Amino acid sequence: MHVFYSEERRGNLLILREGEVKHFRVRRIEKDEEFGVIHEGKIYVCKVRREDKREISCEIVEELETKLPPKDITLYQSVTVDLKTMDTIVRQATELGVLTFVPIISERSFQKEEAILKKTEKWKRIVIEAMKQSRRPIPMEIKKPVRLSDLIPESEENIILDNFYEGVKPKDVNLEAKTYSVVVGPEGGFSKRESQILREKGFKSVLLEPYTLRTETAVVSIVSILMNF
Amino acid sequence: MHVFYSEERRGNLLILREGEVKHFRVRRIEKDEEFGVIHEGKIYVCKVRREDKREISCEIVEELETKLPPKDITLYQSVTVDLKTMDTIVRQATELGVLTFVPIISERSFQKEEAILKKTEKWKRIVIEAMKQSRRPIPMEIKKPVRLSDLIPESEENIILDNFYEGVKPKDVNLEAKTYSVVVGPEGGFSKRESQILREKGFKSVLLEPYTLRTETAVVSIVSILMNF
Ligand SMILES: C[S@@+](CC[C@H](N)C(=O)[O-])C[C@H]1O[C@@H](n2cnc3c(N)ncnc32)[C@H](O)[C@@H]1O
Ligand SMILES: C[S@@+](CC[C@H](N)C(=O)[O-])C[C@H]1O[C@@H](n2cnc3c(N)ncnc32)[C@H](O)[C@@H]1O
């Protein structure tokens, strides 16, 4: 079943707009063909009603039960100097079930906050596309940027991924925790001074084996481990 | 320090040739600056001996401590219909430590064998670049394409990643195995017909939580779990 996204409800009809109208057209949906539509935290099985140029209305047939991630993870991602890489990180974090995404400004990360705020518009659209593809009805919230220097661990388990520090193995982490905070560096990584402060604050430094990975690969590695164990 | 790749040694000198010389010059190495050079399974610390027009000789001054992957993994990757995606999978599999990469032709995968063979040339270049960036001294072999119907469970643990089958959790597979065979599907996944055959042949079906991932995301997810546990 194809899945679409809506942020507009009119009675018992879910409305598709702009990009979703185009996506709907591409799928060449049949008159009585059922499809899913994500709206306000749930996936609704629907059938088509109106097919117009700037709008597709979908009749709600059945409201499905929403499956939530087994763990509540907040990813504090140092913005990559190559902004394009964030498209992948945001997409994959969404697929994996991460609940909250916080862009971080660190010593070696992208530095322009204004550009980060603008790019966030695109990142939110990427989250929506990933939600449709992964059949994830709950959004991944993208928050305003925070500076690494101001972070304070507050989750049940708090981790800093660092290839430059002889940290602990993933299995040494509290895998029974239900809430996590994970801090990941940009291409250049974390400076020794930056990471030291984070470790002193209470972030457990984790080292993935056996090699140093690119930022996006490290994100999926740690999140997949935490989400599945 | 920067790391380079060589397949030619002359006495105590490691030689960089072809495109590697261009790569070296792009890195703008300073006078007396030391750098690493991968050669036959080891990474040597070197300094420039002589720079020529199309080759650079590097004097070995020491040897870096290297580490091999803790697990021997063979990834059987159904070729994605979007061939570009394979560039990412090959690169990440290399970063993660996968030893052997085998492109597979399944019911819903890319079908042109001739095109797969052509792209393999690029995949081999990607492997070398990932080796340099991850400081991985051993290559990842990219084999000729084979059909899903011709796969055999040759490793200590043989797994098929399938979102369409209620398989077991990753933490429940044989994590004490030294060798693994991992089969991953294309964008459209595995048909019920072909997966049933693979399961009967001896492949253990694994289901990642909580949502359906894109192929590349699933690869990093399972490989990271196997390598770190
Ligand atoms: C590419 S790495 C740092 C640069 C890398 N050392 C290099 O020069 O190739 C970017 C980020 O990914 C994460 N990372 C990469 N490899 C890691 C590993 N093996 N263990 C833990 N974190 C890692 C860390 O958050 C790191 O700051
Ligand atoms: C994109 S998935 C299959 C199509 C997907 N269900 C969809 O329609 O969006 C591609 C491949 O990634 C792997 N995969 C993705 N999610 C998975 C999961 N949750 N558990 C196990 N394997 C998964 C499987 O090998 C699958 O064949």
Coordinates of C-alpha atoms and ligand atoms in Angstrom, one line a residue:
Chain A
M1 CA 0.0 0.0 0.0
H2 CA 1.3 3.4 -1.0
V3 CA 1.6 6.0 1.8
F4 CA 1.1 9.8 1.6
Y5 CA 1.3 12.7 4.1
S6 CA -1.4 15.3 5.0
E7 CA -1.5 18.3 7.3
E8 CA -5.0 19.2 6.4
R9 CA -8.3 17.5 7.4
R10 CA -11.7 18.5 6.2
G11 CA -14.4 16.5 7.9
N12 CA -13.8 12.8 7.1
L13 CA -11.4 13.8 4.3
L14 CA -7.6 14.1 4.5
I15 CA -6.2 16.6 2.0
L16 CA -3.0 16.3 0.0
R17 CA -1.3 19.5 -1.2
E18 CA 1.6 20.6 -3.4
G19 CA 4.3 17.9 -3.4
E20 CA 2.0 15.2 -2.2
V21 CA -0.4 15.9 -5.1
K22 CA 2.4 15.2 -7.5
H23 CA 3.4 12.1 -5.7
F24 CA -0.2 10.9 -5.7
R25 CA -0.4 11.4 -9.5
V26 CA 2.8 9.5 -10.1
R27 CA 1.4 6.4 -8.3
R28 CA -1.6 6.3 -10.6
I29 CA -4.0 5.3 -7.9
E30 CA -7.2 3.5 -8.9
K31 CA -10.7 4.6 -7.9
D32 CA -11.3 2.1 -5.1
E33 CA -7.6 1.4 -4.5
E34 CA -6.7 1.8 -0.8
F35 CA -3.7 3.7 0.3
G36 CA -2.4 5.1 3.6
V37 CA -2.3 8.7 4.6
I38 CA -0.3 10.0 7.6
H39 CA -2.1 12.7 9.6
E40 CA -1.5 13.9 13.1
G41 CA 0.4 10.9 14.4
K42 CA -1.5 8.1 12.7
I43 CA -1.8 6.3 9.4
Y44 CA -5.3 6.2 8.0
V45 CA -6.3 3.7 5.3
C46 CA -8.2 5.8 2.7
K47 CA -9.6 5.8 -0.8
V48 CA -9.6 8.7 -3.2
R49 CA -12.4 11.3 -3.4
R50 CA -11.3 14.4 -5.3
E51 CA -8.4 14.6 -7.8
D52 CA -7.7 18.2 -8.7
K53 CA -4.7 20.2 -9.9
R54 CA -3.8 21.6 -6.5
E55 CA -5.6 19.1 -4.2
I56 CA -6.3 15.4 -3.6
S57 CA -9.0 14.7 -1.0
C58 CA -8.9 11.2 0.6
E59 CA -11.9 9.5 2.3
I60 CA -10.9 8.0 5.7
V61 CA -11.8 4.3 5.8
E62 CA -9.9 3.0 8.8
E63 CA -7.7 4.6 11.5
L64 CA -4.7 2.3 12.2
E65 CA -2.9 1.8 15.5
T66 CA 0.5 3.6 15.6
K67 CA 3.7 1.7 16.4
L68 CA 6.1 3.8 18.5
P69 CA 9.9 3.3 18.7
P70 CA 11.1 1.0 21.5
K71 CA 13.4 3.8 22.7
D72 CA 13.3 7.6 22.9
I73 CA 16.4 8.9 21.3
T74 CA 17.4 12.6 20.9
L75 CA 20.2 13.0 18.4
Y76 CA 22.5 16.1 18.9
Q77 CA 24.2 16.3 15.5
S78 CA 27.0 18.7 14.9
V79 CA 26.1 20.3 11.6
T80 CA 28.3 19.0 8.8
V81 CA 30.4 21.5 6.9
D82 CA 29.0 19.9 3.7
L83 CA 25.4 20.8 4.4
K84 CA 24.2 18.2 1.9
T85 CA 25.3 15.4 4.2
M86 CA 22.6 16.5 6.7
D87 CA 20.0 15.5 4.2
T88 CA 21.1 11.9 4.6
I89 CA 21.5 12.1 8.4
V90 CA 18.0 13.6 8.8
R91 CA 16.5 11.0 6.5
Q92 CA 18.1 8.0 8.1
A93 CA 17.5 9.2 11.7
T94 CA 13.8 9.4 10.7
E95 CA 13.8 5.9 9.2
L96 CA 15.5 4.5 12.4
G97 CA 13.0 6.0 14.8
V98 CA 14.9 8.9 16.4
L99 CA 12.3 11.1 18.1
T100 CA 14.1 14.4 18.4
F101 CA 16.9 15.9 16.2
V102 CA 18.9 18.9 17.4
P103 CA 21.4 20.7 15.1
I104 CA 24.6 21.4 17.0
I105 CA 27.2 24.1 16.5
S106 CA 30.7 22.9 17.5
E107 CA 34.2 24.0 17.0
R108 CA 34.6 22.2 13.6
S109 CA 31.0 22.2 12.5
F110 CA 29.1 24.4 10.0
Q111 CA 28.9 27.8 11.8
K112 CA 26.2 29.9 10.2
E113 CA 23.0 29.7 12.3
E114 CA 20.9 31.6 9.8
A115 CA 21.7 29.1 7.0
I116 CA 21.0 26.2 9.4
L117 CA 17.5 27.7 10.2
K118 CA 16.8 28.0 6.5
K119 CA 18.0 24.5 5.7
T120 CA 15.8 23.2 8.5
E121 CA 12.8 23.9 6.2
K122 CA 14.2 21.3 3.7
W123 CA 15.1 18.9 6.5
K124 CA 11.5 18.9 7.8
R125 CA 10.3 18.0 4.3
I126 CA 12.9 15.2 4.2
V127 CA 11.5 13.9 7.5
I128 CA 8.1 13.7 5.9
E129 CA 9.4 11.7 2.9
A130 CA 11.1 9.3 5.2
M131 CA 8.0 8.9 7.3
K132 CA 6.0 7.9 4.2
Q133 CA 8.6 5.4 3.0
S134 CA 9.3 3.9 6.5
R135 CA 5.6 3.8 7.5
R136 CA 6.4 6.0 10.5
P137 CA 3.4 8.1 11.6
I138 CA 5.1 9.9 14.5
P139 CA 7.2 12.9 13.4
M140 CA 10.8 13.4 14.2
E141 CA 10.9 16.9 15.7
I142 CA 13.8 19.1 14.4
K143 CA 14.6 21.8 17.0
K144 CA 16.5 25.1 16.7
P145 CA 20.3 24.9 16.8
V146 CA 22.1 24.6 20.1
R147 CA 25.8 25.2 20.8
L148 CA 27.8 22.1 21.9
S149 CA 29.2 24.2 24.8
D150 CA 25.8 24.6 26.3
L151 CA 24.7 20.9 26.3
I152 CA 23.8 19.2 29.6
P153 CA 23.0 15.5 29.8
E154 CA 19.4 14.9 30.9
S155 CA 18.4 11.5 29.5
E156 CA 18.5 8.1 31.2
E157 CA 21.7 7.3 29.2
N158 CA 23.8 10.0 27.6
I159 CA 26.4 9.2 24.9
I160 CA 29.0 11.1 23.0
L161 CA 30.3 9.3 19.9
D162 CA 34.0 10.0 19.6
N163 CA 36.6 8.4 17.3
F164 CA 39.4 10.5 18.9
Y165 CA 39.0 9.2 22.5
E166 CA 39.6 5.7 23.7
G167 CA 36.0 5.3 24.8
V168 CA 33.9 2.3 25.7
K169 CA 32.3 -0.3 23.4
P170 CA 28.6 0.0 22.6
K171 CA 27.9 -3.1 24.7
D172 CA 29.3 -1.2 27.7
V173 CA 26.4 1.3 27.4
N174 CA 23.2 1.0 29.4
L175 CA 21.2 -0.8 26.7
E176 CA 18.3 -1.2 29.0
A177 CA 17.7 2.6 29.1
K178 CA 14.5 3.9 27.5
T179 CA 15.7 7.4 26.8
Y180 CA 19.0 8.4 25.2
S181 CA 20.9 11.5 24.2
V182 CA 23.5 10.9 21.5
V183 CA 26.1 13.6 20.5
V184 CA 27.8 13.1 17.1
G185 CA 30.6 15.2 15.6
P186 CA 31.0 16.9 12.1
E187 CA 33.5 15.7 9.5
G188 CA 36.4 17.1 11.5
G189 CA 35.3 15.5 14.7
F190 CA 35.4 16.9 18.2
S191 CA 38.4 18.8 19.5
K192 CA 40.1 17.4 22.6
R193 CA 38.9 20.4 24.7
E194 CA 35.3 20.0 23.5
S195 CA 35.0 16.3 24.2
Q196 CA 36.7 16.6 27.6
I197 CA 34.0 19.0 28.8
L198 CA 31.2 16.7 27.5
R199 CA 32.7 13.7 29.2
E200 CA 33.1 15.7 32.5
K201 CA 29.5 16.7 32.2
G202 CA 28.4 13.1 32.1
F203 CA 28.3 12.0 28.5
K204 CA 29.7 8.5 28.1
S205 CA 32.2 8.4 25.3
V206 CA 31.6 5.4 23.0
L207 CA 34.0 4.1 20.4
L208 CA 32.6 2.0 17.5
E209 CA 34.8 -0.8 16.0
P210 CA 36.9 -1.4 14.1
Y211 CA 37.5 1.8 12.1
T212 CA 36.8 5.5 12.0
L213 CA 33.6 6.1 10.1
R214 CA 32.1 9.1 8.3
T215 CA 29.6 11.0 10.4
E216 CA 26.5 9.6 8.7
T217 CA 27.7 6.0 9.0
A218 CA 28.4 6.5 12.7
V219 CA 25.0 7.9 13.3
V220 CA 23.2 4.9 11.8
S221 CA 25.6 2.5 13.6
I222 CA 25.0 3.8 17.1
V223 CA 21.3 4.4 16.6
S224 CA 20.7 1.0 15.2
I225 CA 22.5 -0.6 18.1
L226 CA 20.5 1.4 20.7
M227 CA 17.2 0.9 19.0
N228 CA 17.5 -2.9 18.6
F229 CA 19.0 -3.9 22.0
Chain B
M1 CA 47.8 12.6 9.3
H2 CA 46.6 11.9 5.8
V3 CA 46.7 8.4 4.5
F4 CA 47.4 7.3 0.9
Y5 CA 47.4 4.0 -1.0
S6 CA 50.2 2.1 -2.8
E7 CA 50.6 -1.2 -4.6
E8 CA 54.3 -0.8 -5.4
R9 CA 57.3 -1.0 -3.1
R10 CA 60.9 -0.5 -4.1
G11 CA 63.2 -1.4 -1.2
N12 CA 62.3 1.0 1.6
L13 CA 60.2 3.2 -0.6
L14 CA 56.4 3.0 -1.3
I15 CA 55.3 4.4 -4.6
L16 CA 52.2 6.4 -5.3
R17 CA 51.1 6.4 -9.0
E18 CA 48.2 7.2 -11.3
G19 CA 45.4 9.1 -9.7
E20 CA 47.0 8.7 -6.2
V21 CA 49.6 11.3 -7.2
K22 CA 46.9 13.7 -8.0
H23 CA 45.2 12.9 -4.7
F24 CA 48.5 13.5 -2.8
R25 CA 49.0 16.9 -4.4
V26 CA 45.4 17.9 -3.6
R27 CA 46.2 17.3 0.1
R28 CA 48.9 19.9 -0.1
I29 CA 51.4 18.0 2.0
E30 CA 54.1 20.2 3.7
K31 CA 57.8 19.8 3.7
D32 CA 58.8 17.0 6.0
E33 CA 55.1 16.3 6.8
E34 CA 54.6 12.6 7.6
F35 CA 51.7 10.7 6.2
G36 CA 50.5 7.1 6.1
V37 CA 50.6 4.7 3.2
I38 CA 48.6 1.5 2.9
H39 CA 50.6 -1.3 1.4
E40 CA 49.9 -5.0 1.4
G41 CA 47.8 -5.1 4.5
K42 CA 49.8 -2.6 6.6
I43 CA 49.9 1.1 7.0
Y44 CA 53.4 2.7 7.0
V45 CA 54.3 6.1 8.3
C46 CA 56.3 7.8 5.5
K47 CA 57.8 11.1 4.4
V48 CA 58.4 12.1 0.8
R49 CA 61.6 10.9 -0.8
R50 CA 61.1 12.3 -4.3
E51 CA 58.2 13.8 -6.2
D52 CA 58.1 13.2 -10.0
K53 CA 55.7 14.2 -12.6
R54 CA 53.5 11.0 -12.4
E55 CA 54.8 9.3 -9.3
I56 CA 55.8 10.0 -5.8
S57 CA 58.3 7.9 -3.8
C58 CA 57.7 7.7 -0.1
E59 CA 60.4 6.7 2.4
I60 CA 59.1 4.4 5.2
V61 CA 60.1 5.8 8.6
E62 CA 57.8 3.8 10.8
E63 CA 54.7 1.5 10.9
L64 CA 51.3 2.3 12.2
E65 CA 49.5 -0.1 14.5
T66 CA 46.7 -1.6 12.5
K67 CA 43.5 -3.6 13.4
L68 CA 41.6 -6.1 11.4
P69 CA 37.8 -6.5 11.5
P70 CA 36.6 -8.5 14.6
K71 CA 34.2 -10.5 12.4
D72 CA 34.5 -11.8 8.8
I73 CA 31.4 -10.6 7.0
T74 CA 30.4 -11.3 3.4
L75 CA 27.6 -9.0 2.2
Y76 CA 25.4 -10.3 -0.5
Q77 CA 23.7 -7.0 -1.8
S78 CA 20.8 -7.2 -4.2
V79 CA 21.8 -4.5 -6.7
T80 CA 19.6 -1.4 -6.2
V81 CA 17.5 -0.3 -9.2
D82 CA 19.1 3.1 -8.6
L83 CA 22.7 2.1 -9.3
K84 CA 24.0 5.2 -7.6
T85 CA 22.9 3.9 -4.3
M86 CA 25.5 1.1 -4.6
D87 CA 28.3 3.7 -4.4
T88 CA 27.1 4.5 -0.8
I89 CA 26.7 0.9 0.2
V90 CA 30.1 -0.1 -1.1
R91 CA 31.7 2.8 0.7
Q92 CA 30.0 2.2 4.0
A93 CA 30.6 -1.5 3.9
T94 CA 34.3 -0.7 3.5
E95 CA 34.3 1.7 6.4
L96 CA 32.5 -0.8 8.6
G97 CA 34.9 -3.6 8.0
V98 CA 33.1 -5.9 5.6
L99 CA 35.6 -8.3 4.0
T100 CA 33.7 -9.5 0.9
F101 CA 31.0 -7.8 -1.2
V102 CA 28.9 -9.7 -3.7
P103 CA 26.4 -8.0 -5.9
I104 CA 23.2 -10.1 -6.2
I105 CA 20.4 -10.3 -8.8
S106 CA 17.0 -10.9 -7.2
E107 CA 13.4 -10.7 -8.4
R108 CA 13.1 -7.0 -7.8
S109 CA 16.8 -5.8 -8.1
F110 CA 18.7 -4.2 -11.0
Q111 CA 18.9 -6.8 -13.7
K112 CA 21.6 -5.9 -16.3
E113 CA 24.7 -8.0 -15.4
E114 CA 26.8 -6.1 -18.0
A115 CA 26.0 -2.8 -16.2
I116 CA 26.9 -4.3 -12.8
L117 CA 30.3 -5.4 -14.2
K118 CA 31.0 -1.9 -15.5
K119 CA 30.1 -0.2 -12.2
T120 CA 32.3 -2.6 -10.3
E121 CA 35.3 -0.6 -11.6
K122 CA 34.0 2.5 -9.8
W123 CA 33.2 0.4 -6.7
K124 CA 36.8 -0.8 -6.5
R125 CA 38.0 2.8 -6.6
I126 CA 35.5 3.7 -3.9
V127 CA 36.8 0.9 -1.7
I128 CA 40.3 2.4 -1.9
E129 CA 39.2 5.9 -1.0
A130 CA 37.2 4.5 2.0
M131 CA 40.3 2.5 3.0
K132 CA 42.3 5.6 3.2
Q133 CA 39.7 7.6 5.1
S134 CA 39.0 4.9 7.6
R135 CA 42.7 3.8 8.0
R136 CA 41.6 0.3 6.9
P137 CA 44.7 -1.6 5.6
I138 CA 42.9 -4.6 4.1
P139 CA 40.8 -4.4 1.0
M140 CA 37.2 -5.4 0.6
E141 CA 36.9 -7.8 -2.3
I142 CA 34.1 -7.0 -4.8
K143 CA 33.1 -10.2 -6.6
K144 CA 31.2 -11.0 -9.8
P145 CA 27.4 -10.8 -9.6
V146 CA 25.4 -14.0 -8.8
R147 CA 21.7 -14.8 -8.7
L148 CA 19.9 -15.0 -5.4
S149 CA 18.9 -18.5 -6.4
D150 CA 22.5 -19.6 -6.4
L151 CA 23.4 -18.5 -2.9
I152 CA 24.5 -21.1 -0.3
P153 CA 24.9 -20.6 3.5
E154 CA 28.7 -21.0 3.7
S155 CA 29.4 -19.0 6.9
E156 CA 29.1 -19.9 10.6
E157 CA 26.0 -17.7 10.7
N158 CA 23.9 -16.9 7.6
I159 CA 21.3 -14.2 7.7
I160 CA 18.7 -12.6 5.3
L161 CA 17.5 -9.1 6.2
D162 CA 13.8 -9.0 5.4
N163 CA 11.2 -6.4 6.4
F164 CA 8.4 -8.5 4.9
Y165 CA 8.9 -11.5 7.1
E166 CA 8.4 -11.8 10.9
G167 CA 12.0 -12.8 11.6
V168 CA 14.2 -12.8 14.7
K169 CA 15.8 -9.8 16.4
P170 CA 19.4 -9.0 15.6
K171 CA 20.4 -9.6 19.2
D172 CA 19.1 -13.1 18.9
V173 CA 21.3 -14.3 16.0
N174 CA 24.6 -16.2 16.6
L175 CA 26.7 -13.3 17.7
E176 CA 29.5 -15.6 18.7
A177 CA 30.0 -16.6 15.1
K178 CA 33.4 -15.7 13.5
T179 CA 32.1 -15.6 10.0
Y180 CA 28.8 -14.2 8.6
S181 CA 26.9 -14.1 5.3
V182 CA 24.4 -11.3 5.2
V183 CA 21.8 -11.0 2.4
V184 CA 20.1 -7.6 1.8
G185 CA 17.4 -6.7 -0.7
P186 CA 16.9 -3.9 -3.2
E187 CA 14.5 -1.0 -2.9
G188 CA 11.5 -3.3 -3.6
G189 CA 12.7 -5.9 -1.1
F190 CA 12.4 -9.6 -1.3
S191 CA 9.3 -11.3 -2.8
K192 CA 7.7 -13.9 -0.5
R193 CA 8.5 -16.6 -3.0
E194 CA 12.3 -16.0 -3.2
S195 CA 12.7 -15.3 0.6
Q196 CA 11.0 -18.6 1.4
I197 CA 13.5 -20.4 -0.7
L198 CA 16.4 -18.7 0.9
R199 CA 15.1 -19.5 4.4
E200 CA 14.6 -23.1 3.5
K201 CA 18.2 -23.2 2.2
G202 CA 19.5 -22.2 5.6
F203 CA 19.4 -18.4 5.9
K204 CA 18.0 -17.0 9.2
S205 CA 15.6 -14.2 8.6
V206 CA 16.2 -11.1 10.7
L207 CA 13.9 -8.2 11.3
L208 CA 15.2 -4.8 12.5
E209 CA 13.0 -2.5 14.7
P210 CA 10.9 -0.4 14.6
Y211 CA 10.3 0.7 11.0
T212 CA 11.2 -0.2 7.4
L213 CA 14.5 1.2 6.3
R214 CA 16.0 2.0 3.0
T215 CA 18.5 -0.6 1.8
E216 CA 21.7 1.4 2.6
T217 CA 20.4 2.1 6.1
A218 CA 19.6 -1.5 6.7
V219 CA 23.1 -2.5 5.6
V220 CA 24.8 -0.2 8.1
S221 CA 22.3 -1.3 10.8
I222 CA 23.0 -5.0 10.6
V223 CA 26.8 -4.7 9.9
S224 CA 27.3 -2.3 12.9
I225 CA 25.5 -4.7 15.2
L226 CA 27.4 -7.8 14.1
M227 CA 30.8 -6.0 14.2
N228 CA 30.2 -4.5 17.7
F229 CA 28.8 -7.5 19.4
Ligands
LIG1 C1 34.7 11.2 10.4 S1 34.6 11.2 12.2 C2 36.0 12.3 12.6 C3 37.0 12.4 11.5 C4 37.7 11.1 11.2 N1 38.6 10.7 12.3 C5 38.6 11.2 9.9 O1 39.4 12.1 9.9 O2 38.4 10.4 9.0 C6 33.0 12.2 12.5 C7 32.2 11.8 13.7 O3 31.7 10.4 13.5 C8 31.7 9.8 14.8 N2 32.6 8.6 14.6 C9 33.2 8.2 13.5 N3 33.8 7.1 13.7 C10 33.6 6.7 15.0 C11 33.9 5.6 15.8 N4 34.7 4.6 15.3 N5 33.5 5.6 17.0 C12 32.8 6.5 17.6 N6 32.4 7.6 16.8 C13 32.8 7.7 15.6 C14 32.2 10.8 15.8 O4 31.1 11.5 16.3 C15 33.1 11.7 14.9 O5 33.2 13.0 15.5
LIG2 C1 13.3 -0.6 1.6 S1 13.4 -2.2 2.2 C2 11.9 -3.0 1.4 C3 10.9 -2.0 0.9 C4 10.2 -1.2 2.0 N1 9.4 -2.1 2.8 C5 9.4 -0.1 1.5 O1 8.4 -0.4 0.7 O2 9.7 1.1 1.8 C6 14.9 -2.8 1.3 C7 15.7 -3.9 2.1 O3 16.3 -3.3 3.3 C8 16.3 -4.3 4.3 N2 15.4 -3.9 5.4 C9 14.8 -2.7 5.5 N3 14.1 -2.6 6.6 C10 14.3 -3.7 7.3 C11 13.9 -4.1 8.5 N4 13.2 -3.4 9.3 N5 14.3 -5.4 8.9 C12 15.1 -6.1 8.2 N6 15.5 -5.7 7.0 C13 15.1 -4.5 6.5 C14 15.8 -5.6 3.7 O4 16.8 -6.3 3.1 C15 14.8 -5.0 2.6 O5 14.7 -6.0 1.5

